[PDB]
Amino acid sequence: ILDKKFHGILDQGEGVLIIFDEPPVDKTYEAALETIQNMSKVVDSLYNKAKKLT
Amino acid sequence: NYNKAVEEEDKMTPEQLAIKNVGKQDPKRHLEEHVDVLMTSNIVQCLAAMLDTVVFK
Amino acid sequence: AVQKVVVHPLVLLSVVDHFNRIGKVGNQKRVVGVLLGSWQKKVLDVSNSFAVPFDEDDKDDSVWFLDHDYLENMYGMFKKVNARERIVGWYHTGPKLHKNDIAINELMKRYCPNSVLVIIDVKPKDLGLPTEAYISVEEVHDDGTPTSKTFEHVTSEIGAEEAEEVGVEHLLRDIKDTTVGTLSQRITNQVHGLKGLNSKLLDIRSYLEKVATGKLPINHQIIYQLQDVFNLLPDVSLQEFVKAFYLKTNDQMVVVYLASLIRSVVALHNLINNKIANRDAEKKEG
Amino acid sequence: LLKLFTTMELMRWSTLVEDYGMELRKGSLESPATDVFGSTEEGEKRWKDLKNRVVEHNIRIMAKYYTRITMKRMAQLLDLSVDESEAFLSNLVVNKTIFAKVDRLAGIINFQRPKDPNNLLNDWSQKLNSLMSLVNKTTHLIAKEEMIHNLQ
């Protein structure tokens, strides 16, 4: 459980030593990966912004 | 899927945005079907989340 | 015996024109005409129909007249020019049935052994779908009466067929296609709340009919049992859904996550082109 | 035999000892009851298979049923005690095709095996069934109301 894994988290008082998980949560993942690059696109538009006025 | 997979190519083009006004040639909008499809989608499904309070009491 | 129907509006307009044919003459009661059909599965289809003359005095609702010779002649016509069709029933324009209708039904159930009627309304305002289906079978009775031959309300709809709306949606011209995103949901809210709970309140008006009246078939067989199918939720006060507020939060969960993330990205959509083109137009306007 | 198989409902092992051990002395046929039960070197292995039958008779319907019962209550409704429960249920959790639920924590178990991955069929069942029954409520309650005012 330390080195390797099967999502076998320890409970000293259940019996089943419960393995439960939700793998597909990519809804938030791909949007976060978008926002990471979108902030860069805003930064790379800020040059045009701060340059075209004055 | 239908939103995000189109959204990364919607955000590609500010790499290529620049100045010298006519010296660049590729103006295309990118906000299409991510304003309105998401609007209709999320508003109708939050009213679908309202169905339980509307029907049930 | 009949699963449901698939009924095109063309046969309804074929009722409408004969309604025009009778609105100009001495109209005693209503229209009784032939309903052809395309019966394939236990489901039903109608492509076309035609009428038959009819009068009815009201002394013992037995004086009522058709022309089976004319009926079978024009049936032979439309059967020759189209071997798909056959008769499947009849129709009437007065929205409330009467006791002669069983004599009509069983007198035309001799050609084909089923003859489903169609209630319609030439001036419909309050109803839902005009198309209605009965069938004449027997359950005989709990008291097992001598032949309690009952019309049995079969489910119905308006049918659908490819490119039959070529005339229709060109004619009506007023359709706001795809109002998803605006006010269609609240039209359904007003009409389903009010116009379904008034059906409910007229059901409880029929319950008051069972209170002050209603000895007749008081009907303690199907009424409370399908109302027990309703009474799967006895929604009394204290509201009893402590075991469903977290499920409602789970309902709120994903959609509000989508709302937060996506509409932040929607502000991110608008601002970029809005700022850039905004100050473009602003300080390159002169 | 068939009553032990139609919906099965529980069984007592000692009533089976009665009904199918008075057949090992009562004779009409005597050789198949010998070969299955009266024998020892294989017939007693078939008695062990009968013990498999009584415990799977438990486990099949208790996999069909029993959401939120305890454990000593479970063993006394198994008609076999808690150490016999760990024996008689280990040798059918090696079947490893029935998912059940036990805890100790003082000697108390619980249930509802899939941990409820549902907010979906709640909406499906509840709302689609109820709303379509309610759109039937118009089409047939006002039908019967119009019928009872045809006959009035």
Side-chain angles (χ1 to χ4, degrees), chain C residues 28-46:
Chain C
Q28 182 64 38
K29 184 174 88 276
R30 62 170 57 100
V31 176
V32 171
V34 182
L35 176 70
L36 289 163
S38 178
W39 177 263
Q40 184 62 43
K41 190 66 76 173
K42 194 167 76 76
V43 80
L44 192 148
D45 189 358
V46 175

Side-chain angles (χ1 to χ4, degrees), chain C residues 101-112:
Chain C
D101 293 328
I102 186 173
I104 276 89
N105 191 6
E106 294 294 327
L107 194 141
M108 70 174 69
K109 280 172 77 71
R110 66 184 184 181
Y111 296 102
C112 197

Side-chain angles (χ1 to χ4, degrees), chain C residues 49-66:
Chain C
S49 293
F50 58 94
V52 50
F54 183 82
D55 288 324
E56 196 271 339
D57 294 331
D58 49 356
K59 292 187 184 295
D60 57 355
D61 67 1
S62 298
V63 183
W64 61 271
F65 284 143
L66 299 175

Side-chain angles (χ1 to χ4, degrees), chain C residues 2-5 116 131-135 152-156:
Chain C
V2 177
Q3 191 175 2
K4 64 181 182 296
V5 303
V116 51
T131 58
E132 193 275 334
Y134 293 116
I135 199 66
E152 297 294 325
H153 175 76
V154 190
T155 180
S156 176

Side-chain angles (χ1 to χ4, degrees), chain A:
Chain A
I1 287 105
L2 284 169
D3 287 327
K4 296 299 175 186
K5 75 282 299 173
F6 58 96
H7 291 175
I9 190 62
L10 273 77
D11 192 3
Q12 200 179 7
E14 181 75 23
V16 189
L17 278 294
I18 309 168
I19 303 98
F20 75 102
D21 45 355
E22 292 291 329
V25 68
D26 56 350
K27 180 177 70 70
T28 316
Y29 286 165
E30 186 176 0
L33 292 174
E34 283 177 348
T35 58
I36 287 169
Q37 300 185 1
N38 286 123
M39 291 295 169
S40 68
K41 301 299 185 289
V42 177
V43 167
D44 299 334
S45 63
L46 279 168
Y47 295 96
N48 303 324
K49 295 178 188 295
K51 188 174 287 187
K52 71 178 292 295
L53 291 176
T54 183

